Design a protein around this ligand. Structure first.
Ligand SMILES: *Cc1c(COP(=O)(O)O)cnc(C)c1O
Ligand SMILES: *Cc1c(COP(=O)(O)O)cnc(C)c1O
Ligand SMILES: *Cc1c(COP(=O)(O)O)cnc(C)c1O
Ligand SMILES: *Cc1c(COP(=O)(O)O)cnc(C)c1O
Lengths: 393, 389, 393, 389
């Protein structure tokens, strides 16, 4: 074994895979990072040697994007990954590939807003029936499967309610039923939970959130457990032209290296903040998978590795008015905006940042429902700011 | 009127719009170029001031992408534009927005391969009927329109045959029929043909090609004639997650500035190369709108402005094997690859299928993208290559 | 000869060199554009194979920067090129390499402000004597050469007066005198004049201006006629750590492709604008190498190929007050700012955008002296805006 | 105090400054990250409003670079910071600004190679006398100060020996002597040592190393304790044309956010690797501030905060050939290259010169940059490599 070779028969440990996975020094120059292939087209040597060097057009595939895809397939435990302009585009590509008119698709009722909206507002017009059910109980899913069900789409934890789905149990049901199991583990990251290890057929990620974790790029990823699934997604990406760009792939290859340490820090910070809010006289409920009153504590302890994540939610006593005063008074370092998973701590109120009382209520997004993405700042500053805002609420 | 203002009541001339349309110096700093908003989210000042600064999340809209969209809307003469990760995503978004199960869509039979394939192989599974017809006679279009027809999709010039479609007549037909006319004018560029000026309801562009013209970025654009259409596209883009990145948009804002002079040069070179090939004994036919042998020269002279474009095609005597030997022996500066519209001259023979000769792509059919190299190097390379055919 | 080879024994024509010079498809993937080597360090195969792949540290050299350097050396007719963070850094590196205390350096008295300032304010403290003389007459230079003269630094055309220097004649003198001839041909571009073809030893370029021509990047280049000179510059760049970045190199590799067509359009526009101003009753003098009253018309016709450039200057009747009203009233498309050579037409007043009357007068930068960089907009818009501003002056 | 404001009278804690220092949401859009001002010039509103928006030309200053400079000034506790294309340009600019013919400058004898070489081989031709001495005893510094001495240049820890300099004592010596103290704390990072807090007049940083920590960018920074010093540096940077690019500054603004957790991890790994090597029979000596065998452990415990850093060094028994065989057989995840401070673990043996052993770099001297990989992979690779020594 020489410098540049890995030791044979060794599987690199996890953090090493985050640092190096799917990437070796440039063969041509030894460049330690992958060069950015900011180019549209790739010259062919001859008609007979078409694609011999593996590339022809970046809408189809691109060397930088491919390096990122390989690293992501390694980190998530999948056969192959496909990288997309956004997480919404990865989601939409799954829905586009595996559903046809007359098909049934069970979706967690607490899915990300955008996922729900793309299902109801758009894909339903193709006479695809999306049924949104409670995924907390796996028997609910098992018995909601119909003969037209082709896809079961789980999310865990859920955006923003933080409800968990038992991925292993649902995967068990879907295998027995011969149904595709797709799971959106954006809130979890592979550091906390890898649905493909838990039996999922497909994982969808918004790399915008934690993969990036820097509020820098948009991106999506579809990680497939088999070559058939992977090739289907690959084909449809080429057709829908929603592939990720080389520059975004570079950014994400760079930010993935620190995902484990980032998520550890965010999660410790979030554990402390959730405990603080748990004791606060102005706070009505606190949802965080790591505090002992979490209603799905057992599933969390079963399913979450290392951490319980950077996301939490709470409710301020007083209702919408108090929540709004609180939001309007949360100071820096906090940011009042959308997105999550970033180094920068973010706070938002999903119910004021278009629908009706009863929907957001049945969903769990109450009127004072504040969603919180914890970053890597000093937790004492973050709690100072929350405490101030709360005294103002 | 002081420094930094456009004169009220005056309209910039064409090239000025390419340089400056949709962009002003940065209000905060005066930066002559718009900064790159390489950021995903935008901080809101309060709950009630939500969106007061115009942005929330870059998947929905981004300032750099918006400046490019304003430029493109100005260049193509439309109400609004939306920018996409690719031309194929733009096309797909039109299909997704304006078709439903049971609808009918007429598509030019000589469309870009990708368009034909996403229609026939994906959207057709939603029980959408795509009919491919010959758009060279607008009477065909008029006769083929059904009551379920929602979209007529033209492309002019066509890839790779360079067939032309009469955008104005087709638009009058669709207006009378209240059907949406979408035109893919990627091969023309707005510098030679603007379908919105000719009555098209929507324009689709692969900005990858000429807008970029540098082999650098991928991109797509949908330019909408009306606010209703543009709002629909915008909403669907947000739902599809196929918006263009801010970095890409910065690149394209940069490269658009030289589109007029780039296309002037490419078309000069293309005219010269077409005349050269028109005389070569190894060459069966030459297709370029700028030579008298062009079948649709009347429509060409009516519809094309400034130039006849950087794209041409030609047939080499001897069929597929001849074309292949030529390709294998085309020297630099030519590049054998995909893509078109670049400063780098590109040659390809898409053949290397009885529906090919129905789509007009024959055995020795060679599509040629003329760049801005010295035309003598390009012609000398072509002449050598042909000596090996 | 196969696809990917050039025809043997052919020298590619000029515009072809701008499009392709110093760049071939990526050997590894066939990528038509050079990949961006956004990386600091390059992995070595072994101790004995150190530098075998040619790179180790991007402060010293970088593959993207090297591609740009090769293209630039081709376009300018030099042995080798060295690319720098800015044009000021290239200039400073020349001054740093070839002057020592006690040395004499003749500089054109109408050099770029920054060049003059770095000479007087900084390098003079090393007891280097910079003598600034009129370069319009080559005999002035010949007879101003002293035994301590090591460097003759010409600029042509000059920023902003547009004075020309007879590069061939000065090169002749410097050869006979055994003195280094450096020429800053930023205003000219190699499309109009290549001092290395005219006998210069070194060419300095601010690639910020026309190489870029898009107001996008900063950059500098030093093109050396011999390997000795080139290696000296290379060493000193590594030591002073002012190399250009891979990303800026990519941008410039991309913008160089259109330099010929850009400069043709800018120059036609500038010829028209200079004629218009030549006829304008509010304009006192107009300087443009292309109009028939240019005082150095003969040298211009001798020395300029294809074009007379995008730069012009004029003076408004009325003095500083009229000039200021005019500047304050020039509308878009014009931009009131610094820089030049860009697609965007730019106007500025060097004498109000810190010194004294008599210096700016002896220099030629009069009080109403407006410098104009013409872009590629529609010339009718540009003349409309100038005419408006002038009616306002 | 509403959303978007810092509480008046409060000072952010350390890690918060790494995330947020010197940056606010974009006033125009609310963009949570500052846009990239990839532009050369800035449009002025009028002749008299010249510079009213703060910018004119990116060689002189640029908004992205300025936001990074504000962050860095906050992190290092200085009046101001200027950013440069590289660490070497920062060092060079200090030498250019503060030395003149006939001046004297004391420089640590175990400085980074580049610093020693730009002094001995370039600036010495301006009749500037550079004296290289042993900074481990501040009495040496005090005794070596001449009336022509203008700059004392310390570096702590030193590259590659990891010698420490007592920044506080040296600063007191230079204060009494009214000589400028510049400290290159590149190896320490402000997370472990901030020389400005210890009395240094100037800090120089290669942001290439830990500030970046990703092997991505080159960069330098000069942090000035006073406005006089900072204005001098700024003026000279404008004259030298060696400012940092806006894109680089964007990258570094990004990577700085994780510097604390990166360095925490690297130093944990480094402590474990040093303890491992301290026990290996093939290893002569191990140099890491965090083990009891460290000669300057008292100064280490006094001057280092939080961690003892990601850098270590060690000597392999058998000399140069042993070190070389080890290097040739260090496996992945290790990278054999230059640079340090990255998430990617890097190893090198700078030897492959009687002044080497005067500068303390022996035959089997191996400098090691510990990244954030799993320490077991790193130790296993080192153990194999050593089995081949
Ligand atoms: C944000 C999100 C998405 C959408 O991904 P984008 O990158 O914003 O398009 C999908 N799933 C979850 C859980 C998400 O949070
Ligand atoms: C290439 C092309 C497209 C597709 O655009 P992409 O950017 O490659 O996805 C659409 N129409 C035409 C005419 C095209 O040539
Ligand atoms: C602008 C200029 C320079 C300086 O180059 P920068 O890129 O601005 O540092 C040098 N010479 C001339 C003629 C110039 O115009
Ligand atoms: C590398 C280094 C430098 C030089 O910085 P660059 O960015 O490589 O130019 C200066 N000081 C130390 C300690 C260094 O290690």
């Amino acid at each position: 074994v020489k410098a540049g070779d890995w030791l044979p028969g060794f599987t690199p440990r996890e953090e090493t895979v985050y640092v190096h996975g799917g990437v070796e020094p440039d063969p041509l120059t030894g460049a330690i990072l992958p060069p950015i292939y900011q180019n549209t087209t790739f010259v062919q040597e001859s008609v007979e040697n078409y694609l011999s060097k593996g590339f022809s057009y970046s809408r189809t595939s691109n060397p930088t994007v491919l390096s990122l895809e390989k690293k992501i397939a390694e980190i998530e435990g999948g056969f192959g990954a496909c990288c997309f302009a956004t997480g919404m585009a990865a989601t939409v590509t799954i829905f586009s590939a595996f559903l046809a008119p007359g098909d049934h698709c069970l979706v967690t009722n607490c899915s990300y807003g955008g996922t729900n909206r793309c299902a109801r507002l758009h894909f339903s017009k193709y006479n695809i029936d999306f049924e949104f059910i409670d995924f907390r109980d796996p028997t609910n899913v098992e018995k909601a499967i119909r003969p037209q069900t082709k896809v079961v789409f789980s999310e865990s934890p859920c955006n923003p309610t933080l409800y968990l789905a038992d991925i292993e149990a649902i995967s068990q049901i879907c295998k027995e039923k011969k149904v595709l199991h797709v799971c959106d583990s954006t809130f979890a990251t592979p550091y906390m939970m890898r649905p493909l290890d838990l039996g999922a057929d497909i994982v969808v990620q918004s790399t915008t959130k934690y993969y990036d974790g820097h509020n820098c790029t948009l991106g999506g990823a579809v990680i497939s457990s088999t070559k058939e699934i992977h090739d289907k997604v690959f084909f449809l990406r080429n057709v829908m032209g929603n592939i990720m760009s080389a520059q975004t792939a570079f950014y994400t290859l760079l930010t993935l290296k620190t995902l484990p340490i980032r998520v550890e820090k965010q999660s410790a910070n979030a554990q402390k903040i959730a405990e603080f809010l748990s004791k606060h006289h102005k706070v009505e409920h606190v949802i965080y998978p790591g505090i002992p009153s979490f209603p799905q504590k057992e599933l969390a302890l079963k399913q979450h590795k290392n951490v319980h994540g950077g996301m939490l939610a709470f409710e301020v006593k007083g209702g919408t008015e108090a929540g709004i005063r609180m939001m309007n008074h949360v100071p820096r370092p906090w940011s009042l905006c959308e997105n999550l998973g970033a180094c920068e701590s973010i706070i938002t109120c999903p119910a004021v940042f278009n629908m009706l009382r009863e929907d957001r209520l049945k969903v769990g997004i109450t009127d004072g429902f504040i969603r919180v993405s914890v970053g890597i700042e000093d937790v004492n500053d973050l709690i100072d700011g929350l405490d101030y805002a709360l005294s103002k609420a």
